[PDB]
Coordinates of C-alpha atoms (C1' of nucleotides) in Angstrom, one line a residue:
Chain A
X1 CA 21.7 51.5 201.2
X2 CA 18.4 49.7 201.1
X3 CA 15.4 49.3 198.7
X4 CA 14.5 52.8 197.4
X5 CA 11.0 54.0 198.3
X6 CA 9.1 57.1 197.4
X7 CA 10.2 59.9 199.7
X8 CA 11.0 63.6 199.5
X9 CA 14.1 65.3 201.0
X10 CA 14.3 68.9 202.1
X11 CA 16.1 71.1 204.6
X12 CA 13.8 73.0 206.9
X13 CA 14.7 75.3 209.8
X14 CA 15.0 73.8 213.2
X15 CA 12.0 75.1 215.0
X16 CA 9.5 76.2 212.3
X17 CA 7.4 74.8 209.5
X18 CA 4.1 74.7 207.6
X19 CA 4.5 77.8 205.3
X20 CA 3.3 77.0 201.8
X21 CA 6.2 78.2 199.7
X22 CA 9.0 76.6 201.9
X23 CA 7.2 73.4 202.5
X24 CA 3.5 72.7 202.0
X25 CA 3.1 72.1 198.2
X26 CA 6.6 70.6 198.1
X27 CA 5.8 67.4 199.9
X28 CA 2.1 68.3 199.8
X29 CA 2.0 67.0 196.2
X30 CA 3.1 63.6 197.5
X31 CA 0.1 63.2 199.7
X32 CA 2.0 64.1 202.9
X33 CA 0.1 65.5 205.8
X34 CA 1.7 68.9 206.3
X35 CA 0.1 69.7 209.6
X36 CA 1.2 66.4 211.2
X37 CA 4.8 66.8 209.9
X38 CA 5.2 70.5 210.9
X39 CA 4.3 69.7 214.5
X40 CA 6.1 66.4 214.4
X41 CA 9.3 67.8 212.9
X42 CA 9.5 70.8 215.2
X43 CA 8.9 68.5 218.1
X44 CA 12.2 66.6 218.0
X45 CA 14.1 69.5 216.3
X46 CA 13.9 71.7 219.4
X47 CA 15.7 69.1 221.4
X48 CA 18.2 68.1 218.7
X49 CA 19.0 71.7 218.1
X50 CA 17.2 75.0 217.4
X51 CA 18.5 77.9 215.2
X52 CA 20.2 75.5 212.7
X53 CA 18.6 74.4 209.4
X54 CA 18.5 70.6 209.5
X55 CA 17.8 68.6 206.3
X56 CA 15.2 65.8 206.8
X57 CA 14.2 62.9 204.6
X58 CA 10.4 62.4 204.5
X59 CA 9.3 58.9 203.5
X60 CA 5.7 58.6 202.5
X61 CA 3.9 55.3 202.2
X62 CA 0.9 54.1 200.1
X63 CA -1.1 54.9 203.3
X64 CA 0.3 58.4 202.4
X65 CA 1.4 58.2 206.0
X66 CA 5.0 59.0 206.5
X67 CA 8.2 58.9 208.5
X68 CA 11.4 61.0 208.5
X69 CA 14.9 60.8 209.8
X70 CA 16.7 64.0 211.0
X71 CA 20.3 64.2 210.0
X72 CA 23.0 66.8 210.8
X73 CA 23.0 70.3 209.2
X74 CA 24.6 70.6 205.7
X75 CA 28.4 71.2 205.6
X76 CA 27.9 74.5 203.8
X77 CA 25.6 75.9 206.5
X78 CA 27.9 74.8 209.4
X79 CA 30.8 76.4 207.5
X80 CA 28.8 79.6 207.1
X81 CA 28.1 79.8 210.8
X82 CA 31.6 78.8 211.7
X83 CA 32.9 81.5 209.3
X84 CA 30.4 83.9 210.8
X85 CA 29.1 84.8 207.3
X86 CA 25.6 84.7 205.9
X87 CA 26.3 83.6 202.3
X88 CA 28.9 81.9 200.1
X89 CA 31.5 83.5 197.9
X90 CA 29.5 83.9 194.7
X91 CA 32.8 83.5 193.0
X92 CA 34.6 80.8 195.1
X93 CA 38.4 80.8 195.3
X94 CA 38.5 84.0 193.3
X95 CA 37.3 85.9 196.3
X96 CA 37.4 84.7 199.9
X97 CA 34.3 85.7 201.8
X98 CA 35.6 84.2 205.1
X99 CA 37.9 81.7 206.8
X100 CA 37.8 78.8 209.2
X101 CA 40.6 77.5 211.5
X102 CA 41.5 73.8 210.9
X103 CA 40.3 73.2 214.4
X104 CA 36.8 74.2 213.5
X105 CA 36.9 72.0 210.4
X106 CA 37.5 69.1 212.8
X107 CA 34.5 70.2 214.8
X108 CA 32.2 70.3 211.8
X109 CA 33.6 67.0 210.7
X110 CA 32.8 65.7 214.1
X111 CA 29.2 67.0 214.0
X112 CA 28.4 65.5 210.5
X113 CA 30.4 62.4 211.4
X114 CA 27.2 60.4 211.7
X115 CA 26.3 61.4 208.1
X116 CA 29.8 61.1 206.9
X117 CA 31.4 57.9 205.4
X118 CA 34.9 58.9 206.5
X119 CA 36.7 56.0 208.1
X120 CA 38.8 58.4 210.2
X121 CA 38.6 62.0 211.6
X122 CA 41.3 63.2 209.2
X123 CA 39.2 61.8 206.4
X124 CA 36.0 63.6 207.4
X125 CA 37.9 66.8 207.8
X126 CA 39.2 66.5 204.2
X127 CA 35.6 66.1 203.1
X128 CA 34.5 69.2 205.0
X129 CA 37.4 71.1 203.3
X130 CA 35.8 70.2 200.0
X131 CA 32.7 72.1 200.8
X132 CA 34.7 75.1 202.1
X133 CA 36.7 75.4 198.9
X134 CA 33.4 75.5 197.0
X135 CA 32.0 78.3 199.2
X136 CA 34.9 80.7 199.1
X137 CA 35.9 79.8 202.7
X138 CA 39.6 79.3 203.3
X139 CA 41.0 77.4 206.3
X140 CA 43.9 78.6 208.4
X141 CA 46.1 75.7 209.6
Chain B
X1 CA 32.9 120.9 142.6
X2 CA 33.8 117.8 140.7
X3 CA 31.5 114.8 139.8
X4 CA 32.6 113.0 142.9
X5 CA 31.8 115.9 145.2
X6 CA 28.5 116.5 143.4
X7 CA 27.4 112.9 144.1
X8 CA 28.6 113.0 147.7
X9 CA 26.8 116.3 148.2
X10 CA 23.6 115.1 146.5
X11 CA 23.5 111.9 148.4
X12 CA 24.1 113.8 151.7
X13 CA 21.3 116.3 150.9
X14 CA 18.8 113.6 149.9
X15 CA 19.7 111.6 153.1
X16 CA 19.1 114.7 155.1
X17 CA 15.7 115.1 153.4
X18 CA 15.0 111.5 154.2
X19 CA 15.9 112.3 157.8
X20 CA 13.4 115.2 158.0
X21 CA 10.8 112.7 156.6
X22 CA 11.8 110.1 159.2
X23 CA 11.3 112.7 161.9
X24 CA 7.8 113.8 160.7
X25 CA 6.7 110.2 160.5
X26 CA 8.4 108.6 163.5
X27 CA 6.0 110.0 166.1
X28 CA 3.2 107.7 167.2
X29 CA 0.4 107.8 169.8
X30 CA 1.4 104.5 171.3
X31 CA 3.2 105.0 174.6
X32 CA 1.1 103.5 177.3
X33 CA 0.1 100.3 175.5
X34 CA 3.6 98.9 176.1
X35 CA 3.6 95.4 177.7
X36 CA 7.0 95.9 179.5
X37 CA 5.3 98.8 181.5
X38 CA 3.8 96.5 184.1
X39 CA 6.6 94.0 184.8
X40 CA 8.1 96.0 187.6
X41 CA 5.0 95.7 189.8
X42 CA 5.4 93.5 192.9
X43 CA 2.4 91.2 193.0
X44 CA 1.0 89.8 196.2
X45 CA 1.0 86.1 195.5
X46 CA 0.5 84.0 198.6
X47 CA 1.7 86.9 200.8
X48 CA 5.0 87.0 198.9
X49 CA 6.2 89.8 196.6
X50 CA 6.8 87.9 193.4
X51 CA 7.6 90.2 190.4
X52 CA 4.8 90.5 187.8
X53 CA 6.6 88.7 185.1
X54 CA 7.2 85.5 187.2
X55 CA 3.5 85.3 188.0
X56 CA 1.9 86.7 184.9
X57 CA 2.3 87.7 181.3
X58 CA 1.2 90.9 179.6
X59 CA 0.4 90.7 175.9
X60 CA -1.1 93.4 173.6
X61 CA -3.2 92.1 170.6
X62 CA -3.5 95.7 169.5
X63 CA -2.4 99.0 171.2
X64 CA -6.0 99.8 172.1
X65 CA -6.6 97.1 174.7
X66 CA -4.0 95.4 176.9
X67 CA -4.7 91.9 178.4
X68 CA -2.9 90.6 181.5
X69 CA -3.0 86.9 182.0
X70 CA -2.0 85.8 185.5
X71 CA -1.2 82.1 186.2
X72 CA -2.8 82.3 189.6
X73 CA -6.2 83.9 190.4
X74 CA -5.1 85.5 193.7
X75 CA -2.2 87.2 191.9
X76 CA -4.5 88.6 189.2
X77 CA -6.3 90.5 192.0
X78 CA -3.2 92.1 193.4
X79 CA -2.1 93.0 189.9
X80 CA -5.4 94.9 189.5
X81 CA -4.9 96.9 192.7
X82 CA -1.7 98.4 191.1
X83 CA -2.6 99.1 187.4
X84 CA -4.8 102.1 188.4
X85 CA -3.7 104.8 190.9
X86 CA 0.0 104.4 191.3
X87 CA 1.4 106.8 188.8
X88 CA -0.2 105.4 185.6
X89 CA -3.8 106.3 186.5
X90 CA -5.1 103.6 184.1
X91 CA -8.4 101.7 184.4
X92 CA -8.1 97.9 184.5
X93 CA -11.4 96.0 184.2
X94 CA -11.9 92.4 185.4
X95 CA -13.0 90.6 182.3
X96 CA -12.2 87.0 181.9
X97 CA -9.0 85.4 183.2
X98 CA -7.2 88.5 182.2
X99 CA -7.5 92.2 183.0
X100 CA -8.5 94.3 180.1
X101 CA -6.8 97.6 180.4
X102 CA -8.1 100.1 178.0
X103 CA -5.8 102.7 176.4
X104 CA -7.2 105.9 174.6
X105 CA -9.0 105.0 171.3
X106 CA -9.1 106.9 168.0
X107 CA -12.2 107.0 165.7
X108 CA -12.0 105.9 162.1
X109 CA -12.8 109.4 161.0
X110 CA -9.6 110.7 162.7
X111 CA -7.8 107.7 161.1
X112 CA -8.6 109.1 157.7
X113 CA -7.4 112.6 158.8
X114 CA -4.1 110.9 160.0
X115 CA -3.3 108.7 156.9
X116 CA -3.6 111.8 154.6
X117 CA -1.1 113.7 157.0
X118 CA 1.4 110.8 156.6
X119 CA 1.1 111.1 152.8
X120 CA 1.7 114.8 153.1
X121 CA 4.8 114.3 155.2
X122 CA 5.8 111.6 152.7
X123 CA 5.4 114.1 149.9
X124 CA 7.6 116.6 151.7
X125 CA 10.4 114.1 151.8
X126 CA 10.0 113.0 148.2
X127 CA 9.7 116.5 146.8
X128 CA 12.8 117.5 148.7
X129 CA 14.8 114.5 147.3
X130 CA 13.5 115.1 143.7
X131 CA 14.3 118.8 144.0
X132 CA 17.8 117.8 145.1
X133 CA 18.0 115.6 142.0
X134 CA 16.8 118.6 139.9
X135 CA 19.3 120.8 141.7
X136 CA 22.0 118.2 141.3
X137 CA 21.2 118.2 137.5
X138 CA 21.4 122.0 137.5
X139 CA 24.7 121.8 139.4
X140 CA 25.9 119.1 137.0
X141 CA 25.0 121.5 134.1
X142 CA 27.2 124.2 135.5
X143 CA 29.8 121.6 136.5
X144 CA 29.8 120.2 133.0
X145 CA 30.4 123.6 131.4
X146 CA 32.9 124.5 134.1
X147 CA 35.0 121.4 134.0
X148 CA 34.3 120.9 130.2
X149 CA 32.8 117.5 130.8
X150 CA 31.5 115.7 127.7
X151 CA 27.9 114.8 126.9
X152 CA 28.5 111.1 127.6
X153 CA 30.2 112.0 130.9
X154 CA 27.3 114.2 131.8
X155 CA 24.9 111.3 130.9
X156 CA 26.9 109.0 133.1
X157 CA 26.8 111.5 135.8
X158 CA 23.0 111.9 135.3
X159 CA 22.6 108.2 135.7
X160 CA 24.6 108.2 138.9
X161 CA 22.5 111.1 140.4
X162 CA 19.3 109.3 139.3
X163 CA 20.4 106.1 140.9
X164 CA 21.0 107.9 144.2
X165 CA 17.5 109.5 143.8
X166 CA 15.7 106.2 143.4
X167 CA 17.3 104.8 146.5
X168 CA 15.9 107.7 148.6
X169 CA 12.5 107.4 146.9
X170 CA 12.5 103.7 147.8
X171 CA 13.4 104.5 151.4
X172 CA 10.7 107.1 151.5
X173 CA 8.1 104.7 150.3
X174 CA 9.1 102.1 152.9
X175 CA 9.0 104.6 155.8
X176 CA 5.5 105.9 154.9
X177 CA 4.0 102.4 154.3
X178 CA 5.3 101.0 157.6
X179 CA 4.0 104.0 159.7
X180 CA 0.7 103.7 157.9
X181 CA 0.3 100.1 159.1
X182 CA 1.3 101.1 162.7
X183 CA -1.4 103.8 162.6
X184 CA -3.8 101.3 161.1
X185 CA -3.0 98.9 164.0
Chain C
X1 CA -45.8 164.8 154.4
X2 CA -49.0 162.7 154.3
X3 CA -48.6 162.4 150.5
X4 CA -44.9 161.5 150.8
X5 CA -46.0 159.0 153.5
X6 CA -48.9 157.5 151.5
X7 CA -46.3 156.5 148.9
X8 CA -43.3 155.5 151.0
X9 CA -44.4 155.3 154.6
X10 CA -42.2 154.7 157.6
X11 CA -39.9 151.7 157.2
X12 CA -39.3 149.3 160.2
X13 CA -35.9 147.9 161.1
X14 CA -35.0 144.2 161.0
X15 CA -33.7 143.7 164.6
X16 CA -30.3 142.0 164.3
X17 CA -30.0 139.4 167.1
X18 CA -26.3 139.0 167.7
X19 CA -26.4 135.2 168.1
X20 CA -25.6 132.4 165.5
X21 CA -27.1 129.7 167.8
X22 CA -30.5 131.4 167.2
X23 CA -33.4 129.0 166.6
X24 CA -35.0 131.1 169.3
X25 CA -33.6 128.9 172.1
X26 CA -32.5 129.5 175.7
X27 CA -29.5 127.2 175.1
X28 CA -27.9 124.8 172.6
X29 CA -25.9 121.6 172.9
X30 CA -22.4 121.3 171.7
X31 CA -19.3 119.0 171.6
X32 CA -16.3 121.3 172.3
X33 CA -13.6 121.4 169.6
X34 CA -10.8 122.4 172.0
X35 CA -10.0 124.5 175.1
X36 CA -8.3 127.8 174.5
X37 CA -6.8 130.5 176.8
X38 CA -6.9 133.6 174.5
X39 CA -5.9 137.1 175.9
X40 CA -8.4 139.9 176.5
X41 CA -8.5 143.4 174.8
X42 CA -6.3 146.4 175.3
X43 CA -7.8 147.7 178.6
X44 CA -7.6 144.4 180.4
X45 CA -5.1 141.6 180.9
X46 CA -4.9 138.0 182.2
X47 CA -5.7 135.1 180.0
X48 CA -9.3 133.8 180.0
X49 CA -10.7 130.4 179.1
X50 CA -12.7 129.7 176.0
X51 CA -13.5 126.9 173.6
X52 CA -14.9 126.3 170.1
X53 CA -18.3 124.5 170.1
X54 CA -19.8 122.3 167.4
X55 CA -23.5 123.2 168.1
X56 CA -26.1 120.5 167.3
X57 CA -27.1 122.7 164.3
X58 CA -23.6 122.5 162.9
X59 CA -23.1 126.2 163.6
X60 CA -19.7 126.2 165.2
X61 CA -18.8 128.9 167.7
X62 CA -16.5 129.6 170.7
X63 CA -18.2 129.8 174.1
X64 CA -16.9 131.3 177.3
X65 CA -16.2 129.0 180.2
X66 CA -16.7 131.3 183.2
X67 CA -16.0 130.3 186.8
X68 CA -13.0 130.0 189.0
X69 CA -12.1 126.5 187.8
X70 CA -12.3 125.0 184.3
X71 CA -12.7 121.3 183.7
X72 CA -13.7 120.7 180.1
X73 CA -12.1 118.4 177.6
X74 CA -11.5 118.4 173.8
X75 CA -14.5 116.2 173.4
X76 CA -16.7 116.9 176.5
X77 CA -20.3 117.9 175.8
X78 CA -21.3 121.3 177.1
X79 CA -24.4 123.5 176.7
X80 CA -24.2 127.0 175.2
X81 CA -26.4 129.7 176.8
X82 CA -25.5 133.2 175.5
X83 CA -24.4 136.5 177.0
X84 CA -21.4 137.7 175.0
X85 CA -18.1 138.9 176.5
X86 CA -16.3 142.1 175.8
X87 CA -12.6 141.4 176.5
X88 CA -13.1 138.3 174.3
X89 CA -14.2 139.2 170.7
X90 CA -16.2 136.7 168.6
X91 CA -16.8 135.0 171.9
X92 CA -20.5 135.9 172.4
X93 CA -21.5 132.8 174.3
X94 CA -21.0 130.9 177.6
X95 CA -21.0 127.3 178.5
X96 CA -23.7 126.3 181.1
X97 CA -22.1 125.5 184.5
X98 CA -23.4 122.2 185.8
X99 CA -25.0 120.7 182.8
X100 CA -24.4 117.9 180.2
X101 CA -21.0 116.4 180.2
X102 CA -19.4 119.5 181.7
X103 CA -18.5 120.2 185.3
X104 CA -19.0 123.2 187.6
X105 CA -17.1 125.6 189.8
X106 CA -15.8 124.0 193.0
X107 CA -15.8 125.2 196.6
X108 CA -18.1 128.1 195.5
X109 CA -20.5 129.1 198.3
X110 CA -21.9 132.3 196.9
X111 CA -24.3 132.6 193.9
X112 CA -24.8 128.8 193.8
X113 CA -27.5 129.0 191.2
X114 CA -24.9 130.3 188.7
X115 CA -21.9 128.1 188.3
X116 CA -21.7 124.5 189.4
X117 CA -22.8 124.2 193.1
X118 CA -25.8 122.9 194.9
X119 CA -26.1 123.3 198.7
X120 CA -22.6 123.0 200.3
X121 CA -21.3 120.7 203.0
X122 CA -23.9 122.3 205.2
Chain D
rG1 C1' 27.9 47.9 191.0
rG2 C1' 28.0 53.7 189.7
rA3 C1' 28.1 55.4 196.9
rU4 C1' 29.1 59.9 201.0
rG5 C1' 30.0 65.5 202.4
rU6 C1' 26.4 67.5 198.5
rU7 C1' 20.5 69.7 196.5
rG8 C1' 28.9 72.1 196.0
rG9 C1' 28.9 78.0 196.0
rC10 C1' 26.4 81.8 193.2
rU11 C1' 22.3 82.8 190.5
rU12 C1' 17.0 82.0 190.2
rA13 C1' 10.2 81.6 191.2
rG14 C1' 13.0 76.8 190.9
rA15 C1' 18.7 75.3 189.1
rA16 C1' 19.2 69.1 193.5
rG17 C1' 25.4 65.9 188.0
rC18 C1' 22.6 67.8 183.3
rA19 C1' 19.6 77.0 181.7
rG20 C1' 23.8 79.9 183.0
rC21 C1' 28.7 81.6 185.9
rC22 C1' 32.8 79.7 189.4
rA23 C1' 35.0 75.6 191.5
rU24 C1' 35.6 70.6 190.1
rC25 C1' 38.1 68.8 196.0
rA26 C1' 37.7 65.2 199.7
rU27 C1' 35.9 60.7 201.7
rU28 C1' 34.3 54.9 200.8
rU29 C1' 36.5 51.9 197.6
rA30 C1' 36.8 46.6 193.3
rA31 C1' 34.8 51.1 191.1
rA32 C1' 32.0 55.7 191.8
rG33 C1' 32.8 62.7 187.0
rA34 C1' 30.4 67.9 192.1
rA35 C1' 29.1 64.1 186.1
rA36 C1' 28.1 62.4 179.1
rG37 C1' 23.1 62.7 176.9
rC38 C1' 17.6 62.2 177.6
rG39 C1' 14.2 63.9 181.1
rU40 C1' 11.2 67.1 185.4
rA41 C1' 8.5 73.2 187.0
rA42 C1' 12.3 71.7 190.2
rU43 C1' 13.1 66.6 192.2
rA44 C1' 12.3 61.8 190.3
rG45 C1' 13.6 58.4 186.7
rC46 C1' 16.6 56.3 182.4
rU47 C1' 21.0 55.6 180.0
rC48 C1' 27.0 57.0 180.1
rA49 C1' 32.1 57.3 182.0
rC50 C1' 34.7 53.9 185.3
Chain E
rC1 C1' 12.6 144.2 132.9
rG2 C1' 18.5 139.9 138.4
rG3 C1' 20.8 136.9 141.8
rC4 C1' 23.0 134.8 146.8
rC5 C1' 21.9 134.7 152.4
rG6 C1' 19.4 135.0 157.4
rU7 C1' 14.4 135.4 159.6
rA8 C1' 7.6 135.0 163.5
rA9 C1' 3.8 130.6 167.8
rC10 C1' 4.5 122.7 165.2
rU11 C1' 6.7 122.3 161.2
rA12 C1' 6.8 124.2 155.9
rU13 C1' 6.3 129.3 153.7
rA14 C1' 8.5 134.5 155.0
rA15 C1' 5.5 140.0 155.0
rC16 C1' 10.8 141.4 157.2
rG17 C1' 16.3 142.2 157.2
rG18 C1' 21.1 141.8 154.6
rU19 C1' 24.0 141.9 150.5
rC20 C1' 26.2 141.7 145.2
rC21 C1' 25.1 143.8 140.1
rU22 C1' 21.8 146.7 137.0
Chain F
rG1 C1' 3.0 115.7 137.7
rU2 C1' -0.4 116.9 142.1
rC3 C1' -5.8 117.2 143.9
rG4 C1' -10.8 116.2 142.6
rG5 C1' -14.5 113.1 139.4
rG6 C1' -16.0 108.7 136.9
rU7 C1' -14.2 102.9 138.0
rA8 C1' -14.1 97.0 142.0
rA9 C1' -9.5 98.7 139.6
rG10 C1' -8.7 104.5 134.7
rU11 C1' -0.3 105.6 131.8
rU12 C1' -6.7 107.6 128.2
rC13 C1' -10.8 111.1 129.6
rC14 C1' -13.2 115.5 132.3
rG15 C1' -12.5 119.7 136.2
rA16 C1' -8.5 122.2 138.9
rC17 C1' -3.5 123.9 140.3
Chain G
rG1 C1' 44.2 117.2 105.4
rA2 C1' 45.5 112.8 107.5
rC3 C1' 46.0 109.1 111.6
rU4 C1' 41.7 106.6 113.7
rG5 C1' 40.2 99.0 116.2
rG6 C1' 33.9 102.1 110.8
rG7 C1' 33.6 107.0 110.5
rG8 C1' 32.5 111.4 113.5
rC9 C1' 33.6 114.0 118.5
rG10 C1' 38.0 114.1 121.3
rG11 C1' 43.3 113.6 120.8
rU12 C1' 47.9 113.6 117.7
rC13 C1' 50.7 115.0 113.6
Chain H
rG1 C1' 4.4 118.7 107.4
rA2 C1' 4.4 122.2 111.4
rA3 C1' 5.7 124.4 116.4
rC4 C1' 7.9 125.3 121.5
rG5 C1' 12.3 124.9 124.8
rU6 C1' 17.3 124.0 124.0
rC7 C1' 22.0 123.6 120.7
rG8 C1' 24.2 125.9 116.3
rU9 C1' 26.7 132.0 112.5
rG10 C1' 23.7 128.3 109.6
rA11 C1' 21.9 123.9 106.8
rG12 C1' 19.9 121.4 110.6
rA13 C1' 19.8 118.8 115.5
rC14 C1' 17.7 116.4 120.6
rA15 C1' 18.3 108.9 124.2
rG16 C1' 13.0 116.6 125.0
rU17 C1' 8.0 118.2 124.3
rU18 C1' 3.7 119.1 121.0
rC19 C1' -0.7 118.7 116.7
Chain I
rC1 C1' -17.6 71.3 152.9
rC2 C1' -16.4 66.7 155.6
rU3 C1' -12.3 65.2 158.8
rA4 C1' -12.5 68.9 162.9
rG5 C1' -14.3 73.7 165.6
rU6 C1' -10.9 68.2 166.7
rA7 C1' -4.8 68.2 167.5
rC8 C1' -2.7 72.3 169.1
rG9 C1' -4.4 77.0 172.4
rA10 C1' -4.9 81.1 178.2
rG11 C1' -7.9 82.8 175.0
rA12 C1' -7.9 84.8 170.1
rG13 C1' -7.7 81.4 166.7
rG14 C1' -7.1 77.0 164.2
rA15 C1' -4.4 72.5 161.3
rC16 C1' -2.0 67.6 159.6
rC17 C1' -3.1 63.5 156.8
rG18 C1' -7.1 61.9 153.5
rG19 C1' -11.7 62.8 150.9
Chain J
rC1 C1' -5.8 153.0 158.8
rG2 C1' -4.7 149.1 155.3
rU3 C1' -1.9 144.9 153.6
rC4 C1' 0.7 140.7 155.0
rA5 C1' 1.5 136.3 158.7
rC6 C1' -1.1 133.0 161.8
rA7 C1' -5.8 130.5 164.9
rC8 C1' -11.1 130.1 165.0
rC9 C1' -16.4 131.8 163.1
rA10 C1' -20.0 132.3 159.7
rU11 C1' -20.5 133.1 154.4
rG12 C1' -20.4 134.1 148.5
rG13 C1' -18.2 131.7 144.1
rG14 C1' -17.0 126.0 142.3
rA15 C1' -15.2 120.6 138.0
rG16 C1' -19.3 118.8 140.0
rU17 C1' -21.5 115.1 143.9
rG18 C1' -26.5 113.4 146.8
Chain K
rC1 C1' -32.0 121.6 150.4
rA2 C1' -27.3 118.9 151.7
rU3 C1' -22.2 118.7 150.0
rG4 C1' -17.0 119.7 147.2
rA5 C1' -10.7 120.1 145.5
rC6 C1' -9.9 125.1 145.4
rU7 C1' -11.1 130.3 145.9
rG8 C1' -13.1 135.7 147.4
rG9 C1' -14.3 138.9 150.7
rG10 C1' -16.3 139.7 155.9
rG11 C1' -15.8 139.1 161.4
rU12 C1' -13.6 138.2 165.7
rG13 C1' -9.6 137.6 168.5
rA14 C1' -4.0 138.0 170.3
rA15 C1' -2.1 141.7 168.9
rG16 C1' 3.3 140.4 165.3
rU17 C1' 5.6 142.5 160.7
rC18 C1' 5.4 146.9 157.5
rG19 C1' 4.6 151.7 157.0

RNA sequence: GGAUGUUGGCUUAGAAGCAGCCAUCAUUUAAAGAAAGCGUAAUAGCUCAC
RNA sequence: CGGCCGUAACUAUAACGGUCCU
RNA sequence: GUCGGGUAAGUUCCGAC
RNA sequence: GACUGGGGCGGUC
RNA sequence: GAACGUCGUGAGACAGUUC
RNA sequence: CCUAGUACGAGAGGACCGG
RNA sequence: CGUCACACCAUGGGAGUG
RNA sequence: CAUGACUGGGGUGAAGUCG
């Protein structure tokens, strides 16, 4: 929506960071300061919400300094917790791993509303449904 | 018999002789110089348990030495602590950017003693196949008299038996020669 | 009689030393062709351990590998000593225990000199 | 101009439109394929459909 | 002045056994 | 023919079976 | 003895 | 010319060997 | 042999083109 | 007791070879 | 004096076949 600048995107757990494989080398290649971010990220993430993986967009500058915006957790993850399942279908639509009431879809749609473009609630729900269909999660209306 | 059954029998017999030859040859002393052997080993790489193949390669330039190149230096260490006492009992050496893992050698003197044995097994196959051609010719002689086959018929039958012979001779030569190169490598 | 003696006196007797690895030596080095487990004579039973040796002087010969615990290979270098063995014919030698590329009895606390042992765990 | 859920789910060391398997909806719209090819270790980036 | 068949420690051979006719 | 010999290499040759 | 895709062998008269 | 094996009562013969 | 022990390659090894 | 199998040990003979 | 296709007898062994 603005001028595109160098920046990495990744989904890190709420209250935890700094391991090399998960993070470190990922943004580390960019010139990011892992230590600062790990502490910085976990700082606000505890308040926003712990226990839920939240994707964040790191924006590094020429100063190799950086900023990041914390958005809402992915639709897939919220659907997984709502479904009460650990993973997706593996073979979506063919085999249903779990289900979600339409009410919950509205809840998730509500949560991600900030990130969603949907003009109305019905709209955002329909978008959430899209994710559910891809993960083998049916919705009971 | 008939000509058709003589051919079928002869070809069967020779094939069976070729199979005894295949058996005598097909043993080899390689059986620990395999590269696929070490891919199952979980390697400690950055405290994670990455499979050996994803972190390293195992090549064999000969089946005497085995060299294991490991992309990362830390991983190479943890590969070394597994090659030895596990169930293999091998002896890796740290030599270069790869582990050299020696497999039992064979002196050149024993290599002579081995190549002659191959040729002896080769000769057991060939002698059997030629003796079957000989026997087939003998059977054809009886058959010719018995079924009152003409001379020309018998010569056509001889050519057919001979053609079958030369195929099994050819197959024998190929088997021996290939095994010879394996032994010499 | 003196006369019969003056002509053809009293002949000696070339002492036949039952030992191919002669050379008048206390022992001889070998190479070990293989490791057998041949059976004894008629009076005794139980399979003993032996092994053909390619003595330094070429003279091949099987030596006994006494001790309650063998540990030789088909290429290991041992040292022949002597002293034949009854139950085992043709086997008129024994491999030195605790010498060359051989080993030596384990956990043995009696008759340490013989076999392979030198002052136990104290 | 080619957006958002979304790096779709699975798989995988990684698989983010573009190794592979399944699905291929919904939202914003003037338009915008869970994407046509190149490309990256994977992203990125470039070009295409419209 | 003979055949056919089975057979011992890695095979291969078979001292051995069988069997048909001289 | 097979093995050995001579030869850098020997359908001939020499020694065997 | 002949016939015979020379003759012969084979086969047929 | 001669010989062996073999094919033929045989003269001889062989997509065999031998001097 | 020079190019060039270079390109390529983990090493091992080892060109193109042209002379 | 002597063949005849095997497996080792030493040894005579040998086209000849060094 | 060393060695050689093959070959003869000798010696052990574990004791097999045959008497």
